[PDB]
Design a binder for this molecule. Sequence first.
Ligand SMILES: Nc1nc(N)nc(N)n1
Ligand SMILES: Nc1nc(N)nc(N)n1
Ligand SMILES: Nc1nc(N)nc(N)n1
Ligand SMILES: Nc1nc(N)nc(N)n1
Ligand SMILES: [Mg+2]
Ligand SMILES: [Mg+2]
Ligand SMILES: [Mg+2]
Ligand SMILES: [Mg+2]
Lengths: 364, 364, 364, 364
Amino acid sequence: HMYHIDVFRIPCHSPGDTSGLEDLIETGRVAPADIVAVMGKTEGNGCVNDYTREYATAMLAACLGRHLQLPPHEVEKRVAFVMSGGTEGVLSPHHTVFARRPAIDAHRPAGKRLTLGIAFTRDFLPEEIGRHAQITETAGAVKRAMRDAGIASIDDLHFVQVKCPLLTPAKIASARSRGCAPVTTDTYESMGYSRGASALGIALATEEVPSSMLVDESVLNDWSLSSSLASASAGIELEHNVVIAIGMSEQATSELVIAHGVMSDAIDAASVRRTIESLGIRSDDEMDRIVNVFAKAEASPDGVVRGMRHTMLSDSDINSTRHARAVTGAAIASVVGHGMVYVSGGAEHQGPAGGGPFAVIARA
Amino acid sequence: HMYHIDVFRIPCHSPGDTSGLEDLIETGRVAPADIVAVMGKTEGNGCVNDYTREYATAMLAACLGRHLQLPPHEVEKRVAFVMSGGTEGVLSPHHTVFARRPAIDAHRPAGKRLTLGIAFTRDFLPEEIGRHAQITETAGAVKRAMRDAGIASIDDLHFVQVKCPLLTPAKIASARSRGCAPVTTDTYESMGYSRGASALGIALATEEVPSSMLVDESVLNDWSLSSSLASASAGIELEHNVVIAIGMSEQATSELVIAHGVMSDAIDAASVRRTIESLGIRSDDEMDRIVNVFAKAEASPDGVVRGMRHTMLSDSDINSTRHARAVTGAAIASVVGHGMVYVSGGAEHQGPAGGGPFAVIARA
Amino acid sequence: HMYHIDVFRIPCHSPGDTSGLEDLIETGRVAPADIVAVMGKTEGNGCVNDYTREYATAMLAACLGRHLQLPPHEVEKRVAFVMSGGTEGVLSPHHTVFARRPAIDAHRPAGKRLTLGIAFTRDFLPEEIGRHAQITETAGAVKRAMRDAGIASIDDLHFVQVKCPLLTPAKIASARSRGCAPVTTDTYESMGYSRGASALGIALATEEVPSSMLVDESVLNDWSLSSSLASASAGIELEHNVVIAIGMSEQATSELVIAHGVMSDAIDAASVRRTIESLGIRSDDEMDRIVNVFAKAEASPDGVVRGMRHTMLSDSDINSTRHARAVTGAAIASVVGHGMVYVSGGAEHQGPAGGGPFAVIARA
Amino acid sequence: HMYHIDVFRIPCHSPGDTSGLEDLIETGRVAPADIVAVMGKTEGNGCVNDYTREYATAMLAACLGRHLQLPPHEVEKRVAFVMSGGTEGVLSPHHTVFARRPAIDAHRPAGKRLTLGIAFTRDFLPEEIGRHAQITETAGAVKRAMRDAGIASIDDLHFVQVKCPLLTPAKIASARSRGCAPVTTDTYESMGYSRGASALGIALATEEVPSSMLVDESVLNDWSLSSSLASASAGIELEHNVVIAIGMSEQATSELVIAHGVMSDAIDAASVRRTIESLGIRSDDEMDRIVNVFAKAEASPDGVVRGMRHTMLSDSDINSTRHARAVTGAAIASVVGHGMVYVSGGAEHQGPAGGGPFAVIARA
Ligand SMILES: Nc1nc(N)nc(N)n1
Ligand SMILES: Nc1nc(N)nc(N)n1
Ligand SMILES: Nc1nc(N)nc(N)n1
Ligand SMILES: Nc1nc(N)nc(N)n1
Ligand SMILES: [Mg+2]
Ligand SMILES: [Mg+2]
Ligand SMILES: [Mg+2]
Ligand SMILES: [Mg+2]
């Protein structure tokens, strides 16, 4: 497990736009066969009926399928596509492409460098979403992803992205027909439960939360249970979980590094600055050493931000996750200088309640 | 309990518009002191952050407060204000004003005529919404409203409107601080639970559902439990339930009658025409004998309407109740010739699953 | 121009779902090479940022591309894809597939039968949208489509569907950089202008409106100018217009017929019944002779429907076209028995102001 | 013109909440008769159908009407109510109350201190909104407000808030019935035209734009024309313009000062910190010397923010002004430590295109 990882942030003019990726291939900057994961921000609403996620995946897969002479469906088994919809405010649609080659000879750089591993779980039954099975399956996949990445210990783990399912009326009917109640009957709320259970799965695998406390009825209730590494994103485009583990390894030769932190709340730009700094970035002129930032954001569930009431959880026109992404996208943009960053909404059991984990990838 | 009931449908140009009501008062058509209930449709979103309901109530109360030389808050104890927001599609904002005077002696004439009674419950704690207390309190208020109306039996009862509360983040935090879990943590979903528990309260009082089956865990789960008379509407503007019972009494001398039915689903215009026709109305020029129509509508929770999938429960931009009101408002409008009708959304335990009760008020 | 036309309404479980089409191919019911047009209803918002339209097109093209061993891009030149987003209320996502073979020998049936022709215009510059160039180019394409269909005269023309572009900030900037002002700077409003100009293009070609009156500044102003045959739908997925002309020809041997009418307003179910009847459909049991219904709907621009105010044009949360589709989708559903029908919103210069043209396709 | 100005930021739990104001009155902190203006942020959508603005005004007026024994309508002539809806993201609903008393003699102390003057224009006809009449009337009212404030020169003027009307379908129909075309037929867009014309009115009065260039055809077209002091907010609750001029006067004895700047774009937190720092505030514990911040925000009309595409102008679910307020509310919150600040959206001819003016009020 001695890799060389490459990471490319590429703009999208629309969800189906693969032109930035065609360009990387057509100019020899990346080899199609080495691509192992894509994390995207697509300009749908990021909630239930957002098919921009599936559309982006489908086109990327078709694009890679051509070059590899594979069926799209086969590419989707080989490459972890995680498309997070919702690019509110200044958030600029884009893909972060991850490529992996065997370690660039030896050549062991002075320290640990960026590594990455991927894993998948089985498809979940509707009645399993938001519940124990989703937690335990996720924990398992995290561990395999860690192994696949060549991450020696928890200490070298810096970011765990999970894509997870959500409930539809048909799925709810299917659960009911087996005499099982789904965790909720509201499709929007199902996303939070799916994210939450998945996040707790990560917390289990990282030993951040003792197994004993992970009972179903603690999902979305116990705000104290969380992983400071978990980034979960739900979607209608899949029935299983997709896991990407990102970290640091002595066996990696990547010209890249990753660090992580936590935002104490939606507007905690300070933490972001602090963690960026902890990677030797010391102006606005050095910012271009950052490849991208990946962050979780949420509407504070107590209904307050720094003592003041917010309306993000009372707004029936605009869902809380949409507000939250707009806010945190702005906070981060003010730091790095623009809104082409990965911000995902709904940070249930991810970092502190009202806040969320984030990571930064930069040139070594 | 010998009354003369008058009913007036009055247009609103905006939620605060009381001009249609000032006109009725000025022209001697209604006496301020006789008004006992107003059922309104206001052009807010009909969900959680719809303050058009409270605004309409506040202005109507202030308008009546002037004439009666009362404080608005006192008027709100004397008059049942039930404001249902959400006037999507062709739905036209309006108030239906109900006035009650001592029964006329110079006429009746013969048989049962429109009567109406009102009742209130106590304020509920956040943790009681959607649960047994809300059910039992509602059942009680239904009975009192019946008595106040002078409704001899269940058979003479044609419509039970209930206004009920909903959960906000502050209320949720309050319940949590007492160690009690609210029925849900999603404010939108809370509306359904509040409507549902209230509907089951009506079903209890009407003996339409045996007391034994009304357990908390059945609320929003058991679609077979329902009242074919219940119309529930949730709102952020109150902590208690307001109940208006409408029916027919031999003691009433109103020049008006009420009939009721159920829509088997959101587009079941047929039932509406069938119930209208059961009042000897059968051509679009007799239609002006109808004072108003009052109807419940909902997105079919199996996710299908007559075998075809719908997207009302998967749409995170537009909530299912908004779709449902648009649809049923249209269906009814196509029958009566316009959209100035009372359609409320979310018909949990109200009529059949996917359908909802409705009633028609017409000249004798 | 002696054709046999086949028409298939196929359900979609999601925008990318081509399974209903794979099934028709895999069971010999349709030959991929004969398909000339697909008119779809996809479950995006039907406004500017609805990429469900492009996604559906992309997958259909990829699906057909496999069987024909063509690139998707090439299929999109051969087949007219018109995807109309927005499936509000009871509207059920689906595709209507059109296939064309040379006339099934001779075999001239007793009367005229369904025929269909397609045409395309060039790409428009941003500054041309909503304006004369779009009108005249559309008029031209209508005529070619008529010819391609083998439609002898205007009298045999029953439906003209046009897909047209819309404006984005980038397109607006591009127009500005050439010193030209775009017709509007609001992307949502641009859709109406694009639909409107296109509709007037149809009216020009059909001689329903004299050429003299079609000045730019009459677009969206003069409600009296209209085609009673035009159905226009705007989209972000194309820079040109796509035109499908549908009608009747003595040279066609299709086991299908088409008739058209106009809804005087959004809830004018009567007209639909009337036009259905004019094709010998005489119960609810004969309804299954209808293959599909295609209808335009809009928020009445005077702000009133049958004397009552509506809020469809004052609602900043939900755009007027979304309300309108919900309403008319419901009206039509109440007639044909379900919501799997083609309803498109924004009927500017299409039928009467507040109303819209529709057509019905049925078995001979 | 010798005043003592007091400014109070008071939280609101809902649009109708006047409890924070009752508390100031009860505790002798402010005298009802001295209140001359209230600038509020209410939790409606901030667009066309936001009646939270009117509801807040109505209740504040009724609250003050009680204490002054006046009719609400009379209070509204005496006090400038400017309610800006839309509290997206971390924006916390609140009122800023302005009170004005005869200048204190027992102090001043030295130099210029906060002063404030108000003015009103006549009601505009629908066809005048967005056009020359609105520009010239606004310019006039700015001058009078200046005089009323006792502002010696343009240099001492720091902030000009204007509340302005918008178009409804009824108003549009009215303009049409007089043969006059409204500036737009889209109600949402009308808000921009009203804000823009009003902003140019301010620019005229401040000599920031030469009268010669202010032609109707330049409104929303010429982004180079702007006032760096103008803050305009449109609303359905009024037909005239309300102008509040805020600045510094030697005749004022207020313990408060005002400074202003411009945000170059929506995420330009830097400028805000820079202007804050120009008042000797440089650590998050000195921050409580700020009474409030007042800022304009807008979606950059070129469709890009710092070279990256944004989706704020292409999102048909969420209007650009809602995004913009969320973004800038967040940016500012990250600086002052919370979201209880006045941020208004739509900054047409206000500061730079894509940016907007802001001001800060602080203890001397
Ligand atoms: N698509 C998506 N899903 C979630 N759960 N969160 C975000 N930000 N995007
Ligand atoms: N205001 C309101 N509340 C509910 N629950 N339903 C409707 N239609 N309106
Ligand atoms: N996509 C789409 N575009 C328009 N203009 N109308 C409808 N109904 N759908
Ligand atoms: N109510 C309101 N109106 C405008 N134009 N802008 C904002 N922010 N609020
Ligand atoms: Mg969290
Ligand atoms: Mg029901
Ligand atoms: Mg029309
Ligand atoms: Mg500006």
